[PDB]
Amino acid sequence: GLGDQVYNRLLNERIIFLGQPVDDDIANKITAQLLLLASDPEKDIYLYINSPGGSITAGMAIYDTMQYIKNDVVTIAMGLAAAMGQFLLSAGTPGKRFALPNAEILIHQPSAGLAGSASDIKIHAERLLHTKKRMAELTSQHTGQTIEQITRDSDRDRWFDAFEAKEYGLIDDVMTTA
Amino acid sequence: GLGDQVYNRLLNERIIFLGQPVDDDIANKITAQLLLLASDPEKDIYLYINSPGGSITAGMAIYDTMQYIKNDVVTIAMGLAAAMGQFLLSAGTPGKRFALPNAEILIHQPSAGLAGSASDIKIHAERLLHTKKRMAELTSQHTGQTIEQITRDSDRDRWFDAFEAKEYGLIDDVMTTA
Amino acid sequence: GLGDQVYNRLLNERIIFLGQPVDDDIANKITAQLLLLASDPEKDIYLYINSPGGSITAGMAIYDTMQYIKNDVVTIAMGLAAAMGQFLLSAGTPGKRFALPNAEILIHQPSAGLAGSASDIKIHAERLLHTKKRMAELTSQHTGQTIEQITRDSDRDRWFDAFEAKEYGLIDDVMTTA
Amino acid sequence: GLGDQVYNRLLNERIIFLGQPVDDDIANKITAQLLLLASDPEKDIYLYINSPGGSITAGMAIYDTMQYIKNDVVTIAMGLAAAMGQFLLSAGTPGKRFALPNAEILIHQPSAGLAGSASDIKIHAERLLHTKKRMAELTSQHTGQTIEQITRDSDRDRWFDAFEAKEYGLIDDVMTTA
Amino acid sequence: GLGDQVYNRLLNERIIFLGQPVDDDIANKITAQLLLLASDPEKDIYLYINSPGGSITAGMAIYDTMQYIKNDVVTIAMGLAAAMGQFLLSAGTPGKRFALPNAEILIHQPSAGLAGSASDIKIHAERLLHTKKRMAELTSQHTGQTIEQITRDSDRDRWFDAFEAKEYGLIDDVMTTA
Amino acid sequence: GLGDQVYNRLLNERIIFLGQPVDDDIANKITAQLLLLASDPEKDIYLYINSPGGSITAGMAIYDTMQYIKNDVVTIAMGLAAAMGQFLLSAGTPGKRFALPNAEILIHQPSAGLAGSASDIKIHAERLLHTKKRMAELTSQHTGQTIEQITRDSDRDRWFDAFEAKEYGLIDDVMTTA
Amino acid sequence: DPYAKLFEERVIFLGVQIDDASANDVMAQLLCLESMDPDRDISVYINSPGGSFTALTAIYDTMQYVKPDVQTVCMGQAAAAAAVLLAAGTPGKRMALPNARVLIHQPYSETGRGQVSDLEIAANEILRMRSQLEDMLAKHSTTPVEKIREDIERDKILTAEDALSYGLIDQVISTR
Amino acid sequence: DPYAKLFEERVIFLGVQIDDASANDVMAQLLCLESMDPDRDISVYINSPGGSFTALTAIYDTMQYVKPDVQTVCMGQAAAAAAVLLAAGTPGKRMALPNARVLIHQPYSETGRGQVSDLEIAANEILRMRSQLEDMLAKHSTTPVEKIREDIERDKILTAEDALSYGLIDQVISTRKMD
Amino acid sequence: DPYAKLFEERVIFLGVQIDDASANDVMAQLLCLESMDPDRDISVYINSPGGSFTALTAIYDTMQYVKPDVQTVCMGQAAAAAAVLLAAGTPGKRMALPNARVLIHQPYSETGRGQVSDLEIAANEILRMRSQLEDMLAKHSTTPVEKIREDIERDKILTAEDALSYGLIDQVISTRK
Amino acid sequence: DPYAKLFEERVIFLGVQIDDASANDVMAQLLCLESMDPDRDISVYINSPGGSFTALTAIYDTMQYVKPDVQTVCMGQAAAAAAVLLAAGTPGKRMALPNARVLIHQPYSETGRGQVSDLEIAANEILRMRSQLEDMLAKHSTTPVEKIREDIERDKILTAEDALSYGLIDQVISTRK
Amino acid sequence: DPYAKLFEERVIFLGVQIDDASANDVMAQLLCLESMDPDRDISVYINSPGGSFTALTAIYDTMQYVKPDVQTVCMGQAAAAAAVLLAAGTPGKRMALPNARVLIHQPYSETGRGQVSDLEIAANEILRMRSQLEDMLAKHSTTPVEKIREDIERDKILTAEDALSYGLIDQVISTRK
């Protein structure tokens, strides 16, 4: 009960949380909170990220909602921002993406599985490749690095601390105090 | 029911509890409570630790949140306060770290597991080594000892009572009565 | 529903309950209740025990919180008070420990388990011996008996009743009627 | 559900239920309700028993609370009073023990189990014998029969309807209408 | 959800449901509701039994409460009234027992199981005989049938619709479109 | 939960849902809602059906409650109405049964296996045949399609969509935009 | 295997729980042993913790049927039905090893859920079984039936000397 | 023991699922039969519901390698890989019982979770496997490969005479007395 | 089959925990070997943890019942009932390997749920079992009874030399050379 | 049974995964075949999907130790360790069936929970194992070691002709005509 | 079967986890081989990943007791207790395959529920066992005991040449020319 009350008070101020793996329910809740907060088209919305990633469609729904409203979204990474946690971390408005000094950021390619007959597997593999290409293209567009560089880097797991992420283009600045 | 009300009334007095093992959920709750209490620029926050440790990244999120806000955080150790509990106890504002007389303290190195192909196992190995080195450096910085001393001591489990912890530098003073 | 209301009203008067095995969450709840009731230093607090024991660290945290505040805590045995239940029962302020006429009191040495490599087994062994020694010393201090007598009686699983506890020193009087 | 409000209004009318087996939770609940209702030292407290029994310690705690609050306790057997249930039903204040006409009562000796080494088995066997003796003596005192009579009548299960219990001494009268 | 509000608003109009097999908890709820509604000695109480019976002791708790509150109890059979449900249906006040036109009624002997040594099995067998005889006697008392007729009819099973039960004497009248 | 508020506000408009398979609990709740709404004697109750059916007795209890009240019950079928679902769908007030255009209706004979001894099996087989005959007679009465035709059709599954149901007699009209 | 050669000697061994399979094996072995030689004795070693009553009755009847004298030796333990089998040997041959025990108690059983009439039939059957066990223990021992009735009410554990004074065995052997 | 007795006159049952152990046993028996006499036919009886693909290819290669002619008889059902094995007999010596059935469909596959590159490699492997199956079926029958591709999209079930007209078998045997 | 040859000469090998089935097998083997020759020496090799007390008593009586002498050899370990079986060999030829260990402690029991009288009877039975085990250990050793009372209160672990000094074994064999 | 008949003709099947028992049986068969005749070839047929690394090591060492030439035939598939075993045959005597496949990839492993030092030791061991495997692959093939290092990063599937061009095998056998 | 032929040639083959049953089988085979011929050598082949310590001590004592020389051959791996068996062979007759590996580390133990006293005796026993293992390694190697104590703190992995330099084996098999 205390957690719900403090979350309500923080949402009242402006704060939103992503402290758990991304799936359908959490994507729906965050989309709901963003749509509700979009009623004021002036003040900026803060979004804290601490999650190991999750599903692709749900996170891309969150990203579309982030890019759809006129408000500015300030993403703050704390503790961990891995897989699509990084992806939503880098999706913030330019100049307003931050990480805490002891935060780690991970990048790697998507993963899935296959089952069915030969033709169904063929179709699913084609669309998996398409989704991977779209992920790489969006990462290159947001970070600033070239598409080929991002493709070379995100072939296995890669880790970054705050300053490597800052120089790499994943985040805009490192936030230490207020 | 009753526990939630008691916790709320205690939160009204700027008191935060850190029982149970630390994970993503309790880390998010503690971070939310700290951010909500940080609305007062100049006051104090009391934190009680009775945890046997847990996730490294959640503890890091809590630690960065503690360092981020301007308010002084007073940590009081009761019960076990081991592993990441010890780290969060030692990370309080200098001169404002305390432990009850019959309180244990334990220090040891982190633990994890390995799985995957050779390349992924390798990469995870460097990441684990870097995390361990960072933990040692932060412990040495906060406790006032040398990095080599901390590395040599924290190879196996090491136990302290209140006074040994005070002498070692983990805490500042042992509280007996208000 | 009704239980929450009844416990709320009892806590409202002055009263605290420990009618279950001692572990982390109940220890945090009791510590929170003690701290909350410690706002008024003049009045005293009544506590009831019906418990078969529990973990050492949670009981020691409760004991430390009991001693920390300047309020008087009156412990009343309310059925079975064994292991840590006995330890917390005798930890009340002198002259304010009571048991109902039909109450069972038990004392015995702590029990635990061992697992790991030889060095870890060793270290855990010294820690277990040290905590057993501390428990014996504290029991001897609170009950007025000699440490050797406490060790002799607590090696095995000696039982008691109200009057044997009164003459032994575990309690101060047998409470009947108001 | 609706049961919570129904029980709340019944408590407002000074009515207590025990329609479930006796354990630590329900014993704490009954003791809490008795202590709360003991604020008025004039009015009576009605308690209905419908249970197949439970743990000895919890029932003895309830019995002690009944004998301690110096308020009259009117016990009503309401369908089944077995083992500890019949003990609590006979534990009521004299002249205020009743049973419904179609109510079943029974008496038998306690049961338990033994595990451990030879010394532990020895001690627990002695304690089981002692508590059986105390149960027999208390039943003899409350019913008015002879200790040997109760001992011989409780070697095996013995059943009772309302009138046989009334003539035996388990209850004092049988309510029919008012 | 909605069940609580609808049941409370119906209880405000003195309507009670028994739409589930009878056991300890529902028996306690029914008894509590009957006692609460017994505040007004003039108005009557409606019962809406449709259940496949349950335990004997809970059924007799409810039945004894029905014959004790001095208020007229109107019972209505809606779905399936079998075993103890039939008993509670026919236990209502004479001239105020009804069944909907498409209801089913079942009568049969009690069932149970035996386990233990020879002496305990013997005692429980005698008790089962006694309770079966009491069931038959009470059924023959409430209905206009002889004890021999009832004990012959309830050997295995017997089903009734509304009119057959009316002619037999289980109910008083078939209520439709009222 | 949003379901609670929406269901409350819909019941304030005299609208009832039957969206899950029929059993004891939903039958009890729907009967409670019908009786509660029957306080007003000149308005009508709209009942929406989307269910694959359920137990015979619960459905017959709902049917009897529908027929008992003087209020006319307008039934609307959306999704599907199979087995007891269509039986309650056709049980509405004549001239006031409707189905949405993309709705399916299924009819088939009852099915409920039973086992035991030879005599019990014989008795239960007779009961099953009697219930099947009653089902056939009631649906023939409500659709006006004779008994032999219904018996021939109900040997196996038969499906209808809007217009086939209208011409067959299961419903009265196919609703479009109001 | 040692069991085959012990059988060739003329020794039946009963160190397993008493069920239908073990009783069938014992009866077949007894019949074969009687068939091969109807004059020499048959030795039965008992180390079983009791079992079912019907198998007990079958083995007891087979033992009483055969012409050769059956010498029963108790080693380890003989509980419940095994006590009856040990005491059911021909008089003068029942014997037990020094620190062994014989445990006797009334039968224990349970039945599935059913109507009251079936439970009554089962209870009558179990009472008949206990009475039959009582008679079997009474005729093959020394103590009167009333003392046995009062005695098997609870578990009764007898040492070798206690059994010898009871009459279940005849003489305690230390070494052959 | 009947099975050894039929093995004496060079008869092999394949009546279980096609997996590694079954394939190994079959090829061991085939090699022994070839070694015993290299110029007498070997009879293979098929009553299997299908199986893995590697075992299928191994058995097919062993059948093609041995010098003596292999006569395949379909008895109950011959599904998936069993259909290919039945069609892989010596031409003119492939038989089916009157009420037997033959089921043909494209390979089925399932893979565990992994990165996208591994999934792409696995999908390419599966497509190669399907192409190999199509070629194997086209080689040993009188149907154009395009019709094979169209047919094996879903489960194609053929009776005895449908298989005979389809080209998988050469003869349908009714009774011994009628020759 | 090596075990076949070992039993063929004189050797009974006991390497599994002591329960009813293993005790029955050991008893049958002992009786068979006694039937072969009532004057030779049977050898029993103990490499097992403890077990049920009834099987222990059965095997003890079986060894004490036949004429042929029983030579107990401890190897690996012999704990609880296995220690008593080791000490139950004929005097002068009870031996152990150099690195073997012997563990002794009082019996551990677990009874099912039951009434108080049943538990009292079971407790009396357990106590007399412990006393009987005490007497068996005292009879076959050079240590007085009270010292055994003190020792078997908790787990007692003895090396080969410690066991020899205790009196449980007569010789510690090093090598055949 | 056919298997004994093929064993009499110096033929060994390897049709299950490579574990301790399979490796033990294979090496025992190899030693017995060598002792029976020390100058006749031994045939090994491979239809395995992989297995443990240590068993692969033991089998490979036993193959390299025996005096007679060893001829390896890949029939259905040879994945991971089986590919190394297939390539480890006597040069010029390595064969595969036409519709056969050979799969090569870097080793996979998983470790239980433990402290960081243990994990570092395990990672060093795994890297050493991969280096040994790629050295074995480079020694018995006509491919530069860096090419193998680049190729075995992910799963690599080779047909019979692809394996022949890679140097793993020597001939592809179609029919006996 | 090949195992029977190997046993006829005085080869005891150990490729299974070291437990009570495997230790008993090895001990019985050793006794049988010693009885059949007390002069020829006995070969023990090690492919086991370790096991309990009691079986280790039993096997080591038996293999030291017999008069014939025992030749230990490591292959695949020899971890923990198995390593001791590799180093416990008669000097100059301990050998390993080129690619075999050896694991050495301190014993791992686990104790269930218990009072503090019982855990104290258990910990003392575990420490005694670890010291005994250290002494056993020191006796049969060419390394001072302090170095072994420091080495076995964590898992130590030795290749064939590393084992040869360490003193656990005397030579490394290469091939049969």
Author numbering:
A (entry chain G), B (entry chain F), C (entry chain E), D (entry chain D), E (entry chain C), F (entry chain B): 31 to 208
G (entry chain K): 52 to 227
H (entry chain H): 52 to 230
I (entry chain L), J (entry chain N), K (entry chain M): 52 to 228
Article sentences:
The Clp protease system is important for maintaining proteostasis in bacteria. It consists of ClpP serine proteases and an AAA+ Clp-ATPase such as ClpC1. The hexameric ATPase ClpC1 utilizes the energy of ATP binding and hydrolysis to engage, unfold, and translocate substrates into the proteolytic chamber of homo- or hetero-tetradecameric ClpP for degradation. Here, we present cryo-EM structures of the substrate-bound ClpC1:shClpP1P2 from Streptomyces hawaiiensis, and shClpP1P2 in complex with ADEP1, a natural compound produced by S. hawaiiensis and known to cause over-activation and dysregulation of the ClpP proteolytic core chamber.
